[PDB]
Design an enzyme around this catalytic site. Structure first.
Site, PDB file in Angstrom:
ATOM      1  CD  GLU B  59       4.986   4.431  -0.235  1.00  0.00           C
ATOM      2  OE1 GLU B  59       5.064   4.561   1.002  1.00  0.00           O
ATOM      3  OE2 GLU B  59       4.065   4.941  -0.911  1.00  0.00           O
ATOM      4  CG  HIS B  60       7.043   1.996   4.737  1.00  0.00           C
ATOM      5  ND1 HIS B  60       6.962   2.436   6.040  1.00  0.00           N
ATOM      6  CD2 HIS B  60       5.883   2.360   4.142  1.00  0.00           C
ATOM      7  CE1 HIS B  60       5.802   3.041   6.224  1.00  0.00           C
ATOM      8  NE2 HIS B  60       5.130   3.009   5.089  1.00  0.00           N
ATOM      9  CD  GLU B 136       3.504   5.228   7.704  1.00  0.00           C
ATOM     10  OE1 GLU B 136       3.338   4.266   6.922  1.00  0.00           O
ATOM     11  OE2 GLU B 136       4.229   6.216   7.431  1.00  0.00           O
TER      12      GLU B 136
END
Ligand SMILES: CCCCCCCCO[C@@H]1O[C@H](CO)[C@@H](O)[C@H](O)[C@H]1O
Ligand SMILES: CCCCCCCCO[C@@H]1O[C@H](CO)[C@@H](O)[C@H](O)[C@H]1O
Lengths: 48, 443
Positions: B59-60, B136
């Protein structure tokens, strides 16, 4: 001397049975509720 | 124009399947602006001990460039057209979508396909994001609400796949290979498991056309077009207590196993949750709120906030509530919260559901407030129900619900069940599991 001799012993019989049964059931119940703590696990995760 | 009429006059949702197995659906409106994206049936649940946090790692990179167009090029092109590129990855569902001018629906579709199919997975970008993701994780570690829900899954589904978090482990993130991410993508981002959804001012036939042009790569074998059924995740009545009296407030989450998407009972559970509702210290309503629990919270200052939920999944789910309270009011809060759950199963009123139903309707209508939210519904719907469900159908189902129904359904999933509990923070006042377990009957 003890006219109640016979009745006493009949009661003693029932007492033994009810007791065997009740003690067992209560032993289970105690173990049941305490199982929560008995198998409980823990760890110490201090920061960075 | 009556509520009914407006529900019937809503444009229908068109669906068409390509030969490769991909599904294209969209709802047409007269908006110069639109949203289109691909909803993939992938997520942490599909990962395992070795590749947990891959779908997230991906997703990154899904936005750092493709083969046809490196990073800068990719970004500039999207930025310069005023389009918005967002997306997310969860436990059973992933998504990459774009907000743009209907006038660009086709170029976008090309972009989407390029992202899901030809991600550059730049070897150097990977090591770079490896550090970003690690930051994160520390940021999210301070998000009690999310730490609490993670823990809730960690114990409620211990031993299984839903126990894992979406972001993944520290060891995985530190050692995930360019090959692993690649493997992830090839294994999961596959036509039959994806859904091209779009909403706004777009031609379904133009959408499906660009779709045919860019979403090609058909499969040969049978193993490539079959959607794998995941192994069941066992629910476990249990608790995880993470104590830290240094934290200002305490978070508590309690839940029972839910039915799973396809089950109709979900309409009832959502009505039920509607009765209990939610609350937080800024609800002007105050002590007059209809939700009894909310009323008590205000009168007794039981919490800072609380919320009910009915999280679904393919074959299971979590039905429960979560609250935030001061260390000294946890017990009364939990007392009242469980009390209300008992009331549901036992003494729900027709009035109660009448209100909850209205509340639920306006809630479903709110989740279709814009092109992105509507697009999300389509993606999710086809991916979970294999078909879109109109607001008119929902309303049809919602209308059938009555007090008796709420009681039976609630009694069904709640009464005398062994819950899953997650407590974080200054939780000393929260009584033991056995005490909580008793709050599960009589009420
Ligand atoms: C020791 C002399 C015993 C004579 C009585 C024989 C009956 C014993 O049996 C018991 O007697 C009790 C009192 O009579 C009753 O209350 C009991 O129900 C009966 O089982
Ligand atoms: C743990 C405590 C167990 C108590 C159970 C004992 C119950 C005995 O019960 C007694 O048995 C006698 C014998 O016939 C009768 O005569 C009595 O009327 C009766 O009450």
């Amino acid at each position: 001397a003890e006219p109640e001799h016979d009745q006493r012993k009949r009661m003693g019989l029932k007492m033994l049975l009810i007791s065997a049964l009740l003690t067992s059931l209560l032993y289970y119940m105690k173990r049941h509720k305490w199982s929560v703590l008995k198998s409980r696990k823990m760890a110490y995760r201090p920061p960075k | 124009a009556t509520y009914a009429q407006t529900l019937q006059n809503i444009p229908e949702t068109n669906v068409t399947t390509l030969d490769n197995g991909l599904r294209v659906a969209s709802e047409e409106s007269s908006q110069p602006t639109c949203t289109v994206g691909v909803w993939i049936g992938a997520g942490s649940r599909y990962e395992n001990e070795k590749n947990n946090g891959a779908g997230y790692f991906v997703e990154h990179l899904a936005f750092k460039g493709t083969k046809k167009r490196p990073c800068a090029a990719f970004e500039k092109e999207v930025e310069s057209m005023g389009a918005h590129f967002n997306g997310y990855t969860s436990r059973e569902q992933t998504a990459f979508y774009i907000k743009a001018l209907s006038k660009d629906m086709p170029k976008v579709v090309e972009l989407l396909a390029d992202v899901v199919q030809n991600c550059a997975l730049e070897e150097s970008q990977i090591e770079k994001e490896r550090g970003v993701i690690l930051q994160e994780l520390k940021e999210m570690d301070n998000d009690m609400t999310n730490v609490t829900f993670d823990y809730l899954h960690a114990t409620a589904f211990q031993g299984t796949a839903l126990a894992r978090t979406v972001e993944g482990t520290t060891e995985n993130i530190k050692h995930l290979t360019r090959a692993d991410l690649a493997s992830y993508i090839d294994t999961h981002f596959k036509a039959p498991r994806m859904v091209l959804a779009a909403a706004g001012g777009i031609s379904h036939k133009e959408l499906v056309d660009a779709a045919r042009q860019h979403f090609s790569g058909v499969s040969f074998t049978y193993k490539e077009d079959a959607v794998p059924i995941l192994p069941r995740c066992r629910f476990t009545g249990s608790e995880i207590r993470a104590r830290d009296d240094a934290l200002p407030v305490a978070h508590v989450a309690l839940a029972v196993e839910g039915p799973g998407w396809a089950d109709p009972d979900n309409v009832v559970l959502h009505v039920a949750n509607a009765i209990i509702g939610r609350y937080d210290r800024t609800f002007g309503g105050g002590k007059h709120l209809s939700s009894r629990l909310a009323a008590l919270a205000v009168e007794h200052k039981l919490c800072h906030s609380f919320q009910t939920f009915n999280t679904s999944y393919s074959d299971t789910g979590l039905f429960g509530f979560h609250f935030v309270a001061d260390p000294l009011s946890i017990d009364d809060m939990m007392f009242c919260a469980q009390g209300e759950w008992m009331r549901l199963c036992t003494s729900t009123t027709e009035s109660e559901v009448k209100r909850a139903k209205n509340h639920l309707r306006s809630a479903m209508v709110a989740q279709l407030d814009g092109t992105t939210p509507v697009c999300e519904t389509i993606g999710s719907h086809l991916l979970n129900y294999g078909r879109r469900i109109s607001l008119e159908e929902w309303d049809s189902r919602i209308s059938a619900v009555d007090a008796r129904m709420v009681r039976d359904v609630c009694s069904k999933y709640i009464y005398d069940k062994c819950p899953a509990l997650a407590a974080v923070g200054p939780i000393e006042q929260l009584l033991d599991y056995n005490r909580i377990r008793s709050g599960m009957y009589w009420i």
